[PDB]
Amino acid sequence: HHHHHSGESYPQRQDHELQALEAIYGADFQDLRPDACGPVKEPPEINLVLYPQGLTGEEVYVKVDLRVKCPPTYPDVVPEIELKNAKGLSNESVNLLKSRLEELAKKHCGEVMIFELAYHVQSFLSEHN
Amino acid sequence: HHHHHSGESYPQRQDHELQALEAIYGADFQDLRPDACGPVKEPPEINLVLYPQGLTGEEVYVKVDLRVKCPPTYPDVVPEIELKNAKGLSNESVNLLKSRLEELAKKHCGEVMIFELAYHVQSFLSEHNK
């Protein structure tokens, strides 16, 4: 990696965020468009299986999948956020988390934000564990 | 990467954050540690040359180096944060930014936080574009 961060293009920043998410979450990360092709980069869609922060081996765990699609001008605009496969969470709790995530994303415009969104989910899951 | 995020140890969490910082910031990221010599790695000290985001080239931009050293129990404890090589920022503005990075780091305990610290710096630099 010998590129500079300030002059990057939108496809370069999104591709680099996917590599960062893969290094951080590993098997909990899934690229839903791994065979993306074309002259222009397709909007990436990723799936993050997230767990409560600081979960021990003796604890029962609630979980949820953070599904994010990045528009062409991401991260200058907010991504499409979805919450799927919630375990141990009520429908009102999932709707509450999605509203807080969409509002955190509005204030996080200008830089890649999926990791901070995932951190707030894991913090939310810890409070509901 | 076939690891799981929930069961990682402190050295794994720190090594994965460095790989994420290197992939996102590239040449603006510097690992200030010498070659890994021993069974355990020295605590990571990184340097991030940060600029305001979305630079048009028509604006007068400020910059600063975000220098972070992570303790062994990072990110369960806050890392050591230093702001170096500030260009266009007064020492009061730099010390004001450092105080906010330290309080942001306190609330971000439990998960690696250099990305959110870097974003907070870039947002601070954007407000000084003359």
Short mmCIF file of C-alpha atoms in Angstrom, two decimals:
data_model
loop_
_atom_site.label_atom_id
_atom_site.label_comp_id
_atom_site.label_asym_id
_atom_site.label_seq_id
_atom_site.Cartn_x
_atom_site.Cartn_y
_atom_site.Cartn_z
CA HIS A 1 0.00 0.00 0.00
CA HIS A 2 1.88 3.03 -1.35
CA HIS A 3 -1.11 5.26 -2.14
CA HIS A 4 -1.92 8.58 -0.47
CA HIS A 5 -5.22 9.02 1.33
CA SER A 6 -6.26 12.55 0.34
CA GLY A 7 -6.22 12.09 -3.44
CA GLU A 8 -8.05 8.76 -3.52
CA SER A 9 -11.08 8.21 -5.73
CA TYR A 10 -14.40 6.90 -4.44
CA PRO A 11 -13.81 3.34 -5.77
CA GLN A 12 -10.32 3.34 -4.23
CA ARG A 13 -11.60 4.42 -0.80
CA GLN A 14 -14.44 1.88 -0.82
CA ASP A 15 -12.13 -0.93 -1.94
CA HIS A 16 -9.66 -0.02 0.80
CA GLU A 17 -12.42 0.02 3.43
CA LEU A 18 -13.43 -3.50 2.40
CA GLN A 19 -9.85 -4.68 2.91
CA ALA A 20 -9.86 -2.98 6.31
CA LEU A 21 -13.15 -4.62 7.29
CA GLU A 22 -11.86 -8.02 6.19
CA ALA A 23 -8.72 -7.64 8.32
CA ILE A 24 -10.69 -6.53 11.38
CA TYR A 25 -13.69 -8.88 11.34
CA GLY A 26 -12.38 -11.80 9.28
CA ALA A 27 -14.95 -14.58 9.19
CA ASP A 28 -17.61 -12.23 10.59
CA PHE A 29 -17.20 -10.18 7.39
CA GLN A 30 -18.75 -11.24 4.08
CA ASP A 31 -18.52 -9.52 0.69
CA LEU A 32 -21.96 -9.90 -0.89
CA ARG A 33 -20.65 -8.79 -4.32
CA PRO A 34 -17.28 -10.56 -4.62
CA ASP A 35 -17.45 -10.93 -8.43
CA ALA A 36 -18.04 -7.23 -9.09
CA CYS A 37 -17.13 -6.31 -12.67
CA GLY A 38 -17.66 -3.59 -15.24
CA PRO A 39 -15.94 -0.42 -16.43
CA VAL A 40 -17.36 1.45 -13.42
CA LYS A 41 -17.19 0.01 -9.91
CA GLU A 42 -20.45 -1.47 -8.67
CA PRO A 43 -21.70 -0.23 -5.28
CA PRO A 44 -20.26 -2.63 -2.70
CA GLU A 45 -22.52 -4.50 -0.30
CA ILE A 46 -21.09 -6.14 2.82
CA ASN A 47 -22.46 -8.18 5.71
CA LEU A 48 -21.07 -7.87 9.25
CA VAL A 49 -22.09 -10.44 11.86
CA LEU A 50 -21.75 -8.47 15.10
CA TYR A 51 -21.75 -9.57 18.74
CA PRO A 52 -21.89 -7.73 22.08
CA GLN A 53 -18.73 -5.94 23.16
CA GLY A 54 -16.66 -7.81 25.70
CA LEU A 55 -18.57 -11.09 25.45
CA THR A 56 -17.11 -13.88 27.59
CA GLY A 57 -17.37 -17.63 27.13
CA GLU A 58 -19.83 -18.02 30.02
CA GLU A 59 -22.31 -15.49 28.59
CA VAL A 60 -25.30 -15.93 26.33
CA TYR A 61 -25.11 -13.61 23.33
CA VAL A 62 -27.55 -11.55 21.28
CA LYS A 63 -26.47 -10.78 17.72
CA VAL A 64 -27.46 -8.98 14.54
CA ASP A 65 -26.13 -8.64 10.99
CA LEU A 66 -25.07 -5.17 9.85
CA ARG A 67 -25.73 -5.02 6.10
CA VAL A 68 -24.29 -1.97 4.32
CA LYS A 69 -24.43 -0.89 0.68
CA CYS A 70 -22.12 1.97 -0.28
CA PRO A 71 -23.41 4.48 -2.87
CA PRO A 72 -21.05 5.68 -5.62
CA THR A 73 -20.03 8.84 -3.73
CA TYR A 74 -19.63 7.09 -0.38
CA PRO A 75 -18.30 8.07 2.11
CA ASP A 76 -19.26 11.64 1.16
CA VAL A 77 -22.86 10.38 1.40
CA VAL A 78 -24.43 7.99 3.89
CA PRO A 79 -24.60 4.28 2.98
CA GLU A 80 -27.71 2.13 2.90
CA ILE A 81 -27.98 0.50 6.33
CA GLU A 82 -29.97 -2.65 7.11
CA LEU A 83 -30.25 -4.83 10.22
CA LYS A 84 -30.89 -8.52 9.57
CA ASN A 85 -30.91 -11.82 11.47
CA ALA A 86 -31.43 -10.29 14.91
CA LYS A 87 -31.29 -12.85 17.73
CA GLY A 88 -32.55 -11.96 21.19
CA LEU A 89 -33.66 -8.47 20.12
CA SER A 90 -37.21 -7.16 19.87
CA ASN A 91 -38.51 -5.55 16.70
CA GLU A 92 -38.63 -2.22 18.53
CA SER A 93 -34.98 -2.59 19.58
CA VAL A 94 -33.85 -3.33 16.01
CA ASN A 95 -35.81 -0.35 14.66
CA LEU A 96 -34.32 1.84 17.40
CA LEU A 97 -30.77 0.77 16.53
CA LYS A 98 -31.29 1.37 12.80
CA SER A 99 -32.54 4.91 13.47
CA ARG A 100 -29.48 5.65 15.62
CA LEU A 101 -27.20 4.15 12.97
CA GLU A 102 -28.70 6.26 10.18
CA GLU A 103 -28.21 9.36 12.33
CA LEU A 104 -24.64 8.48 13.30
CA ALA A 105 -23.93 7.97 9.59
CA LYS A 106 -25.30 11.42 8.74
CA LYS A 107 -22.79 13.00 11.14
CA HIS A 108 -19.94 10.75 9.93
CA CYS A 109 -19.98 11.92 6.30
CA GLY A 110 -16.58 12.65 4.77
CA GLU A 111 -14.78 9.46 5.81
CA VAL A 112 -15.47 5.73 5.80
CA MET A 113 -17.79 4.92 8.68
CA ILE A 114 -18.78 1.23 8.60
CA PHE A 115 -16.40 0.33 11.43
CA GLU A 116 -17.79 3.06 13.68
CA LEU A 117 -21.31 1.92 12.78
CA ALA A 118 -20.33 -1.64 13.74
CA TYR A 119 -18.83 -0.37 17.00
CA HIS A 120 -22.11 1.31 17.95
CA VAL A 121 -23.97 -1.92 17.14
CA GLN A 122 -21.66 -3.96 19.37
CA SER A 123 -22.08 -1.35 22.11
CA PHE A 124 -25.85 -1.55 21.60
CA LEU A 125 -25.72 -5.36 21.76
CA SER A 126 -23.75 -5.19 25.02
CA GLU A 127 -26.48 -3.06 26.61
CA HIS A 128 -29.13 -5.62 25.57
CA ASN A 129 -27.19 -8.70 26.71
CA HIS B 1 -8.43 -13.81 7.56
CA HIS B 2 -10.53 -16.60 9.11
CA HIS B 3 -10.48 -15.26 12.68
CA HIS B 4 -13.54 -14.20 14.67
CA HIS B 5 -13.75 -10.69 16.10
CA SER B 6 -15.19 -11.67 19.49
CA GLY B 7 -12.45 -14.10 20.53
CA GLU B 8 -9.38 -12.07 19.61
CA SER B 9 -6.59 -11.32 22.07
CA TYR B 10 -5.00 -7.89 22.56
CA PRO B 11 -2.06 -8.54 20.16
CA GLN B 12 -4.45 -9.86 17.51
CA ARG B 13 -6.74 -6.83 17.84
CA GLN B 14 -3.77 -4.46 17.58
CA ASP B 15 -2.18 -6.28 14.63
CA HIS B 16 -5.50 -6.27 12.76
CA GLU B 17 -6.05 -2.55 13.34
CA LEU B 18 -2.58 -1.80 11.96
CA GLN B 19 -3.37 -3.81 8.83
CA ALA B 20 -6.62 -1.85 8.51
CA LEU B 21 -4.87 1.50 9.00
CA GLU B 22 -2.17 0.57 6.48
CA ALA B 23 -4.79 -0.48 3.91
CA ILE B 24 -6.85 2.71 4.33
CA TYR B 25 -4.11 5.33 4.79
CA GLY B 26 -1.32 3.67 2.79
CA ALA B 27 1.74 5.92 2.62
CA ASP B 28 0.30 8.35 5.19
CA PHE B 29 0.58 5.52 7.76
CA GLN B 30 3.94 4.71 9.37
CA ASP B 31 4.76 1.90 11.80
CA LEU B 32 7.36 3.41 14.14
CA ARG B 33 8.50 0.04 15.48
CA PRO B 34 11.71 -1.68 14.34
CA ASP B 35 11.73 -5.15 12.79
CA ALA B 36 9.82 -7.66 14.92
CA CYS B 37 12.52 -9.37 17.01
CA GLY B 38 11.17 -11.80 19.59
CA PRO B 39 8.17 -13.99 20.40
CA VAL B 40 5.99 -11.01 21.40
CA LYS B 41 5.79 -7.77 19.45
CA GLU B 42 6.53 -4.40 20.99
CA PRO B 43 3.50 -2.17 21.67
CA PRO B 44 2.50 -0.52 18.38
CA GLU B 45 3.37 3.14 17.83
CA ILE B 46 1.86 4.57 14.65
CA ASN B 47 2.07 7.90 12.83
CA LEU B 48 -0.83 9.15 10.70
CA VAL B 49 -0.30 12.15 8.43
CA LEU B 50 -3.85 13.52 8.35
CA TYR B 51 -5.39 16.16 6.07
CA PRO B 52 -8.92 17.55 5.78
CA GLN B 53 -11.18 15.32 3.71
CA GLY B 54 -12.53 16.29 0.31
CA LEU B 55 -9.77 18.71 -0.65
CA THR B 56 -10.55 20.62 -3.85
CA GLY B 57 -7.04 22.01 -4.30
CA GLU B 58 -8.38 25.58 -4.29
CA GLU B 59 -8.37 25.85 -0.48
CA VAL B 60 -5.54 26.54 1.97
CA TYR B 61 -5.37 23.37 4.06
CA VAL B 62 -3.83 22.65 7.46
CA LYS B 63 -2.35 19.33 8.53
CA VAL B 64 -1.06 17.48 11.59
CA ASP B 65 0.51 14.12 12.40
CA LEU B 66 -1.53 11.85 14.67
CA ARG B 67 0.99 9.80 16.68
CA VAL B 68 -0.51 6.98 18.76
CA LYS B 69 1.13 4.33 20.94
CA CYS B 70 -1.11 1.51 22.15
CA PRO B 71 -0.58 -0.03 25.61
CA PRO B 72 -0.56 -3.83 25.96
CA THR B 73 -4.22 -3.91 27.07
CA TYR B 74 -5.38 -1.59 24.30
CA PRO B 75 -8.17 -1.08 23.39
CA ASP B 76 -9.41 -1.81 26.91
CA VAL B 77 -7.25 1.13 28.03
CA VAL B 78 -6.89 4.44 26.21
CA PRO B 79 -3.81 4.84 23.98
CA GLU B 80 -1.18 7.54 24.26
CA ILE B 81 -2.16 10.31 21.83
CA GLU B 82 0.20 12.99 20.52
CA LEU B 83 -0.24 15.62 17.80
CA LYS B 84 2.95 16.38 15.88
CA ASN B 85 4.07 18.50 12.92
CA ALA B 86 1.05 20.80 12.91
CA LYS B 87 1.10 23.11 9.88
CA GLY B 88 -1.23 26.11 10.00
CA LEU B 89 -2.59 25.31 13.48
CA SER B 90 -1.89 27.35 16.60
CA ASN B 91 -0.56 25.55 19.66
CA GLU B 92 -3.86 26.34 21.38
CA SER B 93 -5.80 24.67 18.56
CA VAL B 94 -3.51 21.63 18.69
CA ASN B 95 -3.85 21.29 22.47
CA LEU B 96 -7.61 21.81 22.14
CA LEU B 97 -7.77 18.98 19.60
CA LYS B 98 -5.65 16.72 21.81
CA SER B 99 -7.96 17.22 24.80
CA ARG B 100 -10.94 16.19 22.66
CA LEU B 101 -9.12 13.15 21.25
CA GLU B 102 -8.37 12.02 24.81
CA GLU B 103 -11.99 12.33 25.94
CA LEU B 104 -13.19 10.65 22.74
CA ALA B 105 -10.73 7.82 23.43
CA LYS B 106 -12.12 7.38 26.96
CA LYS B 107 -15.65 6.80 25.63
CA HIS B 108 -14.33 4.50 22.87
CA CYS B 109 -12.82 2.01 25.33
CA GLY B 110 -13.53 -1.62 24.46
CA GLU B 111 -12.89 -1.36 20.71
CA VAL B 112 -9.94 -0.15 18.66
CA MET B 113 -10.33 3.58 18.12
CA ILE B 114 -7.52 5.00 15.96
CA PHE B 115 -9.89 5.25 12.99
CA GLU B 116 -12.39 7.38 14.91
CA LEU B 117 -9.55 9.46 16.34
CA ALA B 118 -8.23 9.99 12.81
CA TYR B 119 -11.68 10.99 11.57
CA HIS B 120 -12.08 13.45 14.45
CA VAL B 121 -8.75 15.05 13.48
CA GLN B 122 -9.70 15.32 9.80
CA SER B 123 -13.00 16.98 10.73
CA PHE B 124 -11.09 19.42 12.94
CA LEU B 125 -8.73 20.27 10.07
CA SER B 126 -11.66 20.81 7.69
CA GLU B 127 -12.97 23.70 9.82
CA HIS B 128 -9.65 25.56 9.38
CA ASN B 129 -9.60 25.50 5.56
CA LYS B 130 -8.95 29.13 4.60
#
